[PDB]
Amino acid sequence: GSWTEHKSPDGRTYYYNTETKQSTWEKPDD
Amino acid sequence: GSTAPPLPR
Secondary structure, X not given: OOEEEEXXXXXXXXXXXXXXXXXXXXXOOO | OOOXXXXXX
8 A cells, every 4th residue: 555545625534545546536445 | 745646537
């Protein structure tokens, strides 16, 4: 794992892959 | 913590 749990400007939460430069609204636990 | 990454599309 190399993602980063961030917070959207709306009030939600989105992760960001700091290894592949990606993003998602769910916790990347693959 | 202003600077932040883009949003997932």
